[PDB]
Amino acid sequence: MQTIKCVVVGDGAVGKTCLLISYTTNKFPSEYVPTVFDNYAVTVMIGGEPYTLGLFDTAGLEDYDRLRPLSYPQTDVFLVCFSVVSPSSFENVKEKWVPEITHHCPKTPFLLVGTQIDLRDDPSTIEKLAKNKQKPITPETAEKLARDLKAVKYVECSALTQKGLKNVFDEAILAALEPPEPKK
Amino acid sequence: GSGLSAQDISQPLQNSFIHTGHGDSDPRHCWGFPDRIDELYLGN
Ligand SMILES: Nc1nc2c(ncn2[C@@H]2O[C@H](COP(=O)(O)OP(=O)(O)NP(=O)(O)O)[C@@H](O)[C@H]2O)c(=O)[nH]1
Numbered sequence: 001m002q003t004i005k006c007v008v009v010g011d012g013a014v015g016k017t018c019l020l021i022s023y024t025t026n027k028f029p030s031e032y033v034p035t036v037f038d039n040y041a042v043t044v045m046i047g048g049e050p051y052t053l054g055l056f057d058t059a060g061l062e063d064y065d066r067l068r069p070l071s072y073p074q075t076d077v078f079l080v081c082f083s084v085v086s087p088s089s090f091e092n093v094k095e096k097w098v099p100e101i102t103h104h105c106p107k108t109p110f111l112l113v114g115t116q117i118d119l120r121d122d123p124s125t126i127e128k129l130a131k132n133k134q135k136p137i138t139p140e141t142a143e144k145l146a147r148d149l150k151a152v153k154y155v156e157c158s159a160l161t162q163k164g165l166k167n168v169f170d171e172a173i174l175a176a177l178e179p180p181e182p183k184k
Numbered sequence: 185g186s187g188l189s190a191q192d193i194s195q196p197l198q199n200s201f202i203h204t205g206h207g208d209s210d211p212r213h214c215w216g217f218p219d220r221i222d223e224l225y226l227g228n
Protein backbone atom coordinates (compact mmCIF):
# COMPACT_ATOMS: atom_id res chain seq x y z
CA MET A 1 0.00 0.00 0.00
CA GLN A 2 2.25 2.78 1.30
CA THR A 3 0.86 6.29 1.64
CA ILE A 4 2.02 9.81 0.83
CA LYS A 5 1.99 13.41 2.08
CA CYS A 6 1.44 16.12 -0.53
CA VAL A 7 3.01 19.28 0.87
CA VAL A 8 4.25 22.06 -1.39
CA VAL A 9 6.43 24.94 -0.25
CA GLY A 10 7.36 27.92 -2.38
CA ASP A 11 5.95 30.63 -4.63
CA GLY A 12 4.42 28.07 -6.97
CA ALA A 13 1.73 25.42 -7.04
CA VAL A 14 4.08 22.68 -8.27
CA GLY A 15 2.73 19.97 -5.97
CA LYS A 16 -0.32 21.98 -4.94
CA THR A 17 -3.96 21.52 -5.93
CA CYS A 18 -3.41 23.47 -9.16
CA LEU A 19 -2.39 20.10 -10.61
CA LEU A 20 -5.61 18.12 -10.15
CA ILE A 21 -7.66 21.30 -9.74
CA SER A 22 -6.79 23.01 -13.03
CA TYR A 23 -6.57 19.55 -14.58
CA THR A 24 -10.32 19.44 -14.01
CA THR A 25 -11.17 23.13 -13.60
CA ASN A 26 -10.77 26.33 -11.53
CA LYS A 27 -8.95 28.06 -14.40
CA PHE A 28 -5.44 29.49 -14.05
CA PRO A 29 -6.07 33.11 -15.19
CA SER A 30 -8.96 33.79 -12.80
CA GLU A 31 -8.44 33.92 -9.03
CA TYR A 32 -6.84 32.04 -6.14
CA VAL A 33 -8.72 31.74 -2.84
CA PRO A 34 -11.61 29.22 -2.79
CA THR A 35 -8.88 26.57 -2.84
CA VAL A 36 -8.41 27.40 0.85
CA PHE A 37 -11.12 24.78 1.43
CA ASP A 38 -8.60 21.94 1.06
CA ASN A 39 -8.82 18.67 3.00
CA TYR A 40 -10.91 17.17 0.19
CA ALA A 41 -11.81 13.55 0.95
CA VAL A 42 -11.53 11.21 -2.03
CA THR A 43 -12.17 7.51 -2.56
CA VAL A 44 -10.23 5.66 -5.26
CA MET A 45 -7.84 2.79 -5.96
CA ILE A 46 -4.28 3.92 -5.15
CA GLY A 47 -2.39 1.21 -7.00
CA GLY A 48 -1.87 -1.23 -4.13
CA GLU A 49 -5.24 -1.48 -2.38
CA PRO A 50 -8.38 0.72 -2.42
CA TYR A 51 -7.23 3.78 -0.50
CA THR A 52 -6.48 7.48 -0.87
CA LEU A 53 -3.98 9.92 0.60
CA GLY A 54 -4.64 13.22 2.34
CA LEU A 55 -3.35 16.43 0.78
CA PHE A 56 -3.47 18.94 3.63
CA ASP A 57 -3.34 22.40 2.08
CA THR A 58 -2.35 25.39 4.19
CA ALA A 59 -3.98 28.81 3.81
CA GLY A 60 -4.74 32.09 5.56
CA LEU A 61 -8.49 32.51 5.16
CA GLU A 62 -11.65 32.15 7.25
CA ASP A 63 -11.19 28.38 7.03
CA TYR A 64 -8.02 28.46 9.13
CA ASP A 65 -5.78 31.53 9.33
CA ARG A 66 -3.91 30.08 12.32
CA LEU A 67 -2.64 26.97 10.53
CA ARG A 68 1.09 26.77 9.77
CA PRO A 69 2.34 23.30 8.73
CA LEU A 70 4.69 24.65 6.05
CA SER A 71 6.86 26.04 8.88
CA TYR A 72 9.27 23.11 9.14
CA PRO A 73 7.65 20.06 7.45
CA GLN A 74 9.44 16.83 8.36
CA THR A 75 8.49 15.36 4.97
CA ASP A 76 11.10 13.54 2.89
CA VAL A 77 10.21 14.84 -0.57
CA PHE A 78 9.58 18.58 -0.83
CA LEU A 79 8.31 20.44 -3.89
CA VAL A 80 10.41 23.23 -5.41
CA CYS A 81 8.75 25.48 -7.99
CA PHE A 82 10.14 27.76 -10.69
CA SER A 83 9.49 29.22 -14.15
CA VAL A 84 11.18 29.47 -17.55
CA VAL A 85 10.91 33.27 -17.54
CA SER A 86 14.13 34.48 -15.93
CA PRO A 87 15.96 37.82 -16.33
CA SER A 88 19.23 36.52 -14.87
CA SER A 89 17.52 35.31 -11.69
CA PHE A 90 18.54 31.66 -12.17
CA GLU A 91 21.58 32.39 -10.01
CA ASN A 92 19.29 33.71 -7.27
CA VAL A 93 16.68 30.94 -7.35
CA LYS A 94 19.46 28.36 -6.96
CA GLU A 95 21.23 30.26 -4.18
CA LYS A 96 17.84 31.18 -2.70
CA TRP A 97 16.09 27.80 -2.64
CA VAL A 98 18.95 25.39 -1.90
CA PRO A 99 19.87 27.32 1.30
CA GLU A 100 16.21 27.87 2.18
CA ILE A 101 14.75 24.37 1.84
CA THR A 102 17.79 23.15 3.78
CA HIS A 103 17.59 25.92 6.38
CA HIS A 104 14.20 24.81 7.72
CA CYS A 105 15.07 21.14 7.27
CA PRO A 106 18.65 19.75 7.44
CA LYS A 107 19.02 18.96 3.74
CA THR A 108 15.57 18.32 2.25
CA PRO A 109 15.03 16.85 -1.26
CA PHE A 110 12.75 18.41 -3.87
CA LEU A 111 11.32 18.10 -7.38
CA LEU A 112 11.43 20.47 -10.35
CA VAL A 113 8.25 21.03 -12.36
CA GLY A 114 7.45 22.68 -15.67
CA THR A 115 4.29 24.59 -16.56
CA GLN A 116 4.80 28.14 -17.82
CA ILE A 117 7.18 26.60 -20.38
CA ASP A 118 4.15 26.71 -22.69
CA LEU A 119 3.92 30.52 -22.66
CA ARG A 120 7.44 31.56 -21.64
CA ASP A 121 8.46 29.90 -24.90
CA ASP A 122 7.07 33.03 -26.57
CA PRO A 123 9.53 35.73 -27.76
CA SER A 124 7.62 38.43 -25.87
CA THR A 125 8.06 37.55 -22.21
CA ILE A 126 11.51 36.47 -23.29
CA GLU A 127 12.21 40.04 -24.36
CA LYS A 128 11.38 41.05 -20.80
CA LEU A 129 14.06 38.62 -19.68
CA ALA A 130 16.38 40.02 -22.31
CA LYS A 131 16.52 43.17 -20.18
CA ASN A 132 18.89 41.16 -17.98
CA LYS A 133 19.36 37.89 -19.88
CA GLN A 134 16.84 36.24 -22.31
CA LYS A 135 17.79 32.60 -21.71
CA PRO A 136 14.53 30.68 -21.01
CA ILE A 137 14.81 27.78 -18.59
CA THR A 138 14.27 24.89 -20.99
CA PRO A 139 12.66 21.63 -19.77
CA GLU A 140 16.19 20.22 -19.83
CA THR A 141 17.60 23.12 -17.81
CA ALA A 142 15.49 22.48 -14.71
CA GLU A 143 16.51 18.83 -14.97
CA LYS A 144 20.18 19.84 -14.84
CA LEU A 145 19.92 21.88 -11.64
CA ALA A 146 17.37 19.43 -10.24
CA ARG A 147 19.77 16.49 -10.51
CA ASP A 148 22.62 18.76 -9.40
CA LEU A 149 21.38 18.38 -5.83
CA LYS A 150 20.16 14.82 -6.39
CA ALA A 151 16.63 16.14 -5.84
CA VAL A 152 14.45 13.90 -7.98
CA LYS A 153 13.74 14.85 -11.60
CA TYR A 154 12.08 17.52 -13.74
CA VAL A 155 9.13 16.16 -15.71
CA GLU A 156 6.83 17.79 -18.27
CA CYS A 157 3.65 19.62 -17.26
CA SER A 158 1.43 22.51 -18.35
CA ALA A 159 -1.68 24.07 -16.79
CA LEU A 160 -2.47 25.81 -20.09
CA THR A 161 -1.71 23.35 -22.89
CA GLN A 162 -1.66 20.18 -20.75
CA LYS A 163 1.85 18.72 -20.97
CA GLY A 164 0.91 15.80 -18.74
CA LEU A 165 0.39 17.42 -15.35
CA LYS A 166 0.01 14.10 -13.54
CA ASN A 167 3.41 13.13 -14.93
CA VAL A 168 5.56 15.61 -13.01
CA PHE A 169 3.16 15.68 -10.07
CA ASP A 170 3.35 11.88 -10.10
CA GLU A 171 7.09 12.15 -9.56
CA ALA A 172 6.46 14.39 -6.55
CA ILE A 173 4.20 11.90 -4.78
CA LEU A 174 6.31 9.03 -6.07
CA ALA A 175 8.97 9.95 -3.52
CA ALA A 176 6.29 9.25 -0.91
CA LEU A 177 4.76 6.21 -2.60
CA GLU A 178 8.17 4.51 -2.40
CA PRO A 179 11.94 5.23 -2.55
CA PRO A 180 12.62 6.07 -6.24
CA GLU A 181 15.90 5.72 -8.13
CA PRO A 182 17.94 8.60 -9.65
CA LYS A 183 19.68 8.76 -13.03
CA LYS A 184 23.47 8.65 -12.67
CA GLY B 185 -1.06 1.49 -13.64
CA SER B 186 1.57 4.21 -13.36
CA GLY B 187 4.75 2.31 -12.54
CA LEU B 188 7.86 4.07 -11.31
CA SER B 189 9.93 1.85 -8.99
CA ALA B 190 7.47 2.01 -6.10
CA GLN B 191 5.18 -1.02 -6.02
CA ASP B 192 3.93 0.30 -9.38
CA ILE B 193 1.16 2.17 -7.60
CA SER B 194 -1.05 4.51 -9.62
CA GLN B 195 -0.73 8.14 -8.53
CA PRO B 196 -3.91 10.05 -7.50
CA LEU B 197 -6.19 8.39 -10.04
CA GLN B 198 -9.49 9.81 -11.27
CA ASN B 199 -12.88 9.84 -9.54
CA SER B 200 -11.04 11.21 -6.50
CA PHE B 201 -13.11 14.34 -5.93
CA ILE B 202 -16.04 14.27 -3.50
CA HIS B 203 -15.70 17.87 -2.28
CA THR B 204 -15.31 18.22 1.48
CA GLY B 205 -14.23 21.78 2.21
CA HIS B 206 -15.63 25.22 3.02
CA GLY B 207 -13.48 28.23 2.10
CA ASP B 208 -14.82 29.97 -1.02
CA SER B 209 -13.29 33.43 -1.25
CA ASP B 210 -14.61 35.37 -4.25
CA PRO B 211 -12.10 37.16 -6.56
CA ARG B 212 -10.14 39.46 -4.27
CA HIS B 213 -6.97 40.32 -6.20
CA CYS B 214 -6.93 37.66 -8.94
CA TRP B 215 -3.55 36.58 -10.31
CA GLY B 216 -1.79 39.17 -12.45
CA PHE B 217 1.86 38.68 -11.55
CA PRO B 218 3.53 35.27 -10.98
CA ASP B 219 5.28 34.30 -7.75
CA ARG B 220 2.42 32.48 -6.02
CA ILE B 221 2.03 32.93 -2.29
CA ASP B 222 3.65 30.36 0.01
CA GLU B 223 1.55 27.40 1.13
CA LEU B 224 1.07 29.30 4.40
CA TYR B 225 -1.33 31.60 2.60
CA LEU B 226 -2.20 29.76 -0.62
CA GLY B 227 -4.86 32.28 -1.59
CA ASN B 228 -5.30 36.03 -1.18
N1 LIG C 1 7.21 26.58 -15.19
C1 LIG C 1 6.75 26.41 -13.95
N2 LIG C 1 5.65 27.08 -13.53
C2 LIG C 1 5.33 26.81 -12.23
C3 LIG C 1 5.99 25.95 -11.35
N3 LIG C 1 5.35 25.94 -10.11
C4 LIG C 1 4.38 26.77 -10.30
N4 LIG C 1 4.27 27.34 -11.52
C5 LIG C 1 3.25 28.29 -12.00
O1 LIG C 1 2.40 28.73 -10.92
C6 LIG C 1 1.02 28.53 -11.27
C7 LIG C 1 0.28 27.85 -10.13
O2 LIG C 1 -0.79 28.67 -9.63
P1 LIG C 1 -1.27 28.54 -8.10
O3 LIG C 1 -1.90 29.82 -7.71
O4 LIG C 1 -0.14 28.01 -7.31
O5 LIG C 1 -2.41 27.41 -8.19
P2 LIG C 1 -3.64 27.11 -7.20
O6 LIG C 1 -3.49 28.02 -6.04
O7 LIG C 1 -3.62 25.65 -6.93
N5 LIG C 1 -5.12 27.45 -7.90
P3 LIG C 1 -6.46 27.94 -7.02
O8 LIG C 1 -6.89 29.24 -7.56
O9 LIG C 1 -7.71 26.94 -7.19
O10 LIG C 1 -6.06 27.87 -5.60
C8 LIG C 1 0.99 27.68 -12.52
O11 LIG C 1 0.06 28.20 -13.48
C9 LIG C 1 2.38 27.65 -13.06
O12 LIG C 1 2.46 28.37 -14.30
C10 LIG C 1 7.14 25.24 -11.80
O13 LIG C 1 7.84 24.44 -11.17
N6 LIG C 1 7.46 25.53 -13.14
Ligand SMILES: [Mg+2]
Binds near residue numbers: 016017018021035
Ligand atom coordinates in the same frame (compact mmCIF):
# COMPACT_ATOMS: atom_id res chain seq x y z
MG1 LIG D 1 -5.26 25.75 -5.30
